[PDB]
């Protein structure tokens, strides 16, 4: 029926009035490119030779446009239509002789998409307004979209078979609006939490931390090679920090050339001992902490996520507040290029020598676990002989199992502290954890010391059989190993019964994420 | 402000590898000639196949690919052959090509191996390396194969079928006298083949005013060129690149007025 | 044109608008014979 | 295939040795389709006479 | 390789690897499911290091001059069906070579590859937008149909089969062969849940080498390990290095309890390398040593099915529908991307009012209508003679125009068909 | 803070607690062409055609359903050309 | 085309009378035959 | 076909010119050479030679994109010297080094026609 | 399906060593010793023969 012809979703009121399907829109995979500015994107030549842009003919661009119309649909930088004043849309593919075509003021050529154009780029789910920023075209050989890395944080992207769309503004008013409203250097700080969204990222952060240590000296050739990559260099070579016995520059001395203008900032490094501001050496800092950027040059301190990432009061935040939106772009690009071209001299890796513990540590960890098991046995036996006293508002099982859980937590904390206690300065796990690039301080202990204690539904492993967890135990066993305590490390490998409990914990942790996406998407749609 | 006087010294010489040592030179020059043994030494190989009848198990583009990777004797007549894009002939001529021919038919019941002994050429200077036999395909009673191929000239930047060498070893400073690499525990590392340390030492003592010299090479060969003409044709090829670039340069700063 | 039986591999010219069967074998699956215009490949 | 009730999706201990504990698809069909272990054997039926 | 008689089966979408290999570290329960007679993968030499930044965030660098020797090369088959049919007493189809002056509905494509039958002989090189089967329908003269390829195939016709299907109609099947060399979009995965695309390909003269000239085939990022803790990946490349030097094939039966990291370490030292798989690598560009020691060894990788040749598409002023005049898919596989509801809100928060209009109206079904001034109803306009007449009000003087989308027009027309007059007053 | 304040202010503006739900949005002084975009087009629009409801087009979703400049930013105003400044303006063409 | 392209400012609803229904219809007298085409 | 042919990496087109000079305007006595259809094999061999000149203040090179074929070289010399001078003096010193090493090599291989031992 | 003609990493010619490899394993040799009697000393060229599955011998069972 007629009222049936205009139903809800996919009717005529909710499926073709506000949500529809547009043209001049492409789609393909994305891959990294550290040699692009944060406001550029890389487009293949098969997409660029397909989408067009109508350009009005004026006596300022008559010769260039008739040259473009000489070559059509065969050479790449060409054109494929001429729209004269009458509305006549002629096609260059079928016209017998092109030379007769004489462009005239008022005509309108349909150009091929060339370098310097402006596009709009978004990712699959659009959550906040940073998930659709205006980029700038730059055309490259192969067939994937190429974009910088510091911009992957707003889009929430990663390069394992992802895809993104682009739309090409056709008019000139829309081009101007996109240019002065939504270009990516204009959306560095967000109004949601008044802090930057783009910071230095995965691989450049680990290297920036090592490049600004107290002892990094560069020769002459390497300093020249690094200065070759600065886009805002005035042309002068600074005087080395060590003139004799031979000239050597320092890491901070080269980094002081990247920092724009004359800004001021004071932060701390993630290993600042809290008892340093108390005694002397408050302004000396034996460990080289308390970053100090005075008058636009690094005087002291190591750089990390607390001082270059996306937090309030960072270096990028201050550079945006004081200098503007067109200098922070150069800041990002220069940091990335210089640090990558030094990293291919310094190198970085991870192996199993970084995952190997020491003899003493292995021994000590075993002892703490043996004592932890002894305590759990005491509590259980004490409860059977009915020597436990429940606490206010606690059942005996509660009181029982929560005391056992507290003992297990204390044992796990001691094992973790022991695992943390033994690392070296050359370790490559500590190098990604300290700089804040990737990882946490518990993965170190899980790889080296103890995996810990599993639990489903927020509680210990339940009795899935009748009064048992598996047919390899005796009934009503309440020990630590019989209800989920994995006492090995990922390196030393797990035993079968522990491999099963680990699978259980992982499974519940895997289901929750599957639910969360749909729930949050729907509620946000309603509210908006 | 001038060049150096490098000195060569050969250690081994076989029909498939050369070991030598280049003293008193710079690292950038000792590496730029390590990339020329691989990429820019010309050689002959098949680059045009046309199949008349293929009733074997492998499809047509499988056999056209196992043919190009067969190495042909390119010893002496690579200098007389033009590049087929430079030669003033048509698509092909005996001045910039060599024509091959294969034609095999299996009639007995026992299976048949189609080796490289079947590639029959017209020029007796370029033949596959047979003077065992590379296998191309096996045939069953009632199957056959016949084709025609031409063999052009190129180097290893086009395609990896035109490079003349297997693995090319290279190394310098066998003991960390310069500390170019930093060992965390210098005791677990095996001692190099070229080292001169004692049996109970790990590294030489650090010396700051040092510089890398005395590079060690080891160039093997796949079978096309002798292992000592791979080197002579590389140095004579790199020299002719700079010598041609100096022409274009002086032609630029002369036309500056 | 010319067709090849699917069992005995005996070529037999089948005329336009004619039933599809072999001869000497009585079979109903035919494969068309390979063309005679030549195409060239690259060893690359 | 979309019900949010977890108890028909979580891993039961009784699945020991008869259904593979690790192999299952992600998405909306988590824990709904399952593969059986290597030596698991399903009965065919008989009469009780 | 999925089955041994893959030559006979004309399946659709069959992938086949050139050189499969069986693992060097095997579980004992793989002899019973035939994984050493139909394997899927190749043992590659993997190094875990950060080299130039092109393998960050789940990517891999791979050796270019190993791809040129057959590494992970494969093929790709595909089949097409066509069936001649007598749908009516007069409407009848037939395989034949359509000629230009007799048949009428043909495009501007070449029809020279077809034979007299109407099918392509096997062996030719069929490219995108070529016709392969010529099928003409008789008109109550002759109105031809045909089947064209998809876009960007560049295949080679493998073999053509002709026979009779179930209800006895003649029908044919055609298989197209195409070779796929690994490139920098393809997806590779290990045996422990580490998928990742390919970032860039370096030649052998640029990869880092050991002190005897062993360059790795694949380089992966060290940051992939510490967050997801897959240490089983770090032992099979240590166990694998003992199996290639001794000549056995290793054993990885789960809880065997027969192998320790410490035990394997002792054996490697005897052969002559750093005890913990670590080795001293030289830089490939400058020949200098690398200060750290890199963990290197052989592992077993697989090549997943998602290739990049299949996921790239673009649209720029393509074919549109007929009823609603909305962009439609065409013969080139390539339609438009949907501009959903959540994308309509990021643009509103941005404050971009022009770009929001272009994407929804000027890019999708633009349209113009004429509207009367006193009443708000559409009017009749014959612009050939320049007569703008409003019926119902006898207005000819003050007519107007309103540029609006097309999908909103026929919404108004289906409201007028239910006794509702939506009036678009311009003031 | 501004976001929390604005949300919890527009949520309790009409005096009583109206949930952001199906029948919480169903009730306000809104036009007819917005309640037709939500699952009860025909009946409420028949009510409107019977009672003779107007529609001022001040909304944003109202104004993009007909393809016009929504009165959001960049549409909150309109420009006029003045004939005076053009006088002392140069002219190449 | 000569008529000015203007805007919309208000949409008024209402039921339309049979009077204008007959006055503005295009097929005078009315559609009578249930068969669409004859030859 | 969305992949370039292999010969585009070394074969010059018709309109292109292999080398191009531009003067840097930020500092005196600086120049910027742009060699076309080239890579690290030739780029690095030049830079190491310029640094051996005691009258050169700066020298470096970069490949601006690994997927295009073009390098850039920057030189700066003392006020009594010319960048175009220092550049061509570097090349003639490489050629004088390679041709010398070829003679010393061809002697070493014929030093064991029958064998020294 | 058939032994590659060149190792993927080095470039050394392998395609002529498959029949000799089967001939050495035929008598009494271990895989570790047969590979040394052929001159394969890098572990990238030993992976070539050690992990090769020969599928061409099973496609010759179907009559042409
Ligand atoms: Mg992803
Ligand atoms: Zn010729
Ligand atoms: Zn027959
Ligand atoms: Zn009117
Ligand atoms: Zn090898």
Coordinates of C-alpha atoms in Angstrom, one line a residue, chain I residues 8-62:
Chain I
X8 CA 64.9 -17.3 -2.5
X9 CA 67.5 -15.5 -0.3
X10 CA 71.0 -16.1 -1.6
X11 CA 70.3 -16.9 -5.3
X12 CA 72.4 -20.1 -5.3
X13 CA 71.2 -22.7 -7.8
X14 CA 69.3 -25.4 -6.0
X15 CA 67.1 -26.9 -8.8
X16 CA 69.7 -29.4 -9.8
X17 CA 70.2 -31.1 -6.4
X18 CA 66.9 -32.8 -5.8
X19 CA 67.6 -36.2 -7.4
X20 CA 71.1 -36.4 -5.8
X21 CA 69.5 -35.6 -2.4
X22 CA 67.1 -38.5 -2.7
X23 CA 69.9 -40.7 -3.8
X24 CA 71.9 -40.0 -0.7
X25 CA 69.0 -40.5 1.7
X26 CA 68.5 -43.7 -0.2
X27 CA 71.6 -45.5 1.1
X28 CA 72.1 -44.6 4.7
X29 CA 72.8 -40.8 5.0
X30 CA 71.2 -38.6 7.6
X31 CA 69.6 -35.4 6.4
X32 CA 72.4 -33.5 8.2
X33 CA 75.1 -35.3 6.3
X34 CA 73.5 -35.5 2.8
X35 CA 73.2 -31.7 2.9
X36 CA 76.9 -31.3 3.7
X37 CA 77.9 -33.7 0.9
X38 CA 76.2 -31.3 -1.6
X39 CA 77.8 -28.1 -0.4
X40 CA 74.9 -26.3 1.2
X41 CA 76.4 -24.5 4.2
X42 CA 74.2 -21.5 4.9
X43 CA 71.0 -22.3 6.7
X44 CA 69.0 -20.4 4.1
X45 CA 70.0 -22.8 1.4
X46 CA 69.4 -25.9 3.5
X47 CA 65.8 -24.9 4.3
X48 CA 65.2 -25.2 0.5
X49 CA 65.7 -28.9 0.4
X50 CA 64.9 -29.9 3.9
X51 CA 61.3 -28.5 3.8
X52 CA 60.3 -29.3 0.2
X53 CA 57.2 -31.3 -0.6
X54 CA 57.1 -32.8 -4.1
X55 CA 53.5 -32.5 -5.4
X56 CA 54.4 -33.0 -9.1
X57 CA 54.7 -36.8 -8.6
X58 CA 51.0 -37.0 -7.7
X59 CA 49.7 -35.0 -10.6
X60 CA 51.3 -37.5 -13.0
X61 CA 48.8 -40.1 -11.9
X62 CA 45.9 -38.6 -13.9

